[PDB]
């Protein structure tokens, strides 16, 4: 099972800050693209109740 | 320019408001001023002054 990280700039997560001021707040954002697929999935079996 | 103003008491994180310098004229129509005198010869000769 593969977890695929994709960041526009560098490697993983982005944490971007804004000065605004006009109303001075200071913003911290963050961001990632995440997706995750099995390569094969019959490597799994779940548990069922 | 305009008056000098007292800034405004504000909320946090709220925007701060626009009252920038103002600016008129005064206009010159500079007026033309005048004076005449007119003599005549016989005047200007027989005159001790
Ligand atoms: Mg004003």
Known sequence: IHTILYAPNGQDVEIKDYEDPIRDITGVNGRLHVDCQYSQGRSSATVQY | ?49
């Open chain 2, 1 to 49: 320019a305009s008056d000098e103003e007292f800034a405004r008491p504000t909320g946090q994180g709220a925007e701060i408001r626009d009252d920038g310098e103002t600016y008129t004229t005064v206009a010159w129509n500079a007026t033309k001023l005048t004076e005449g005198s007119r003599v005549t010869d016989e005047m200007r000769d027989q005159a001790m002054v």
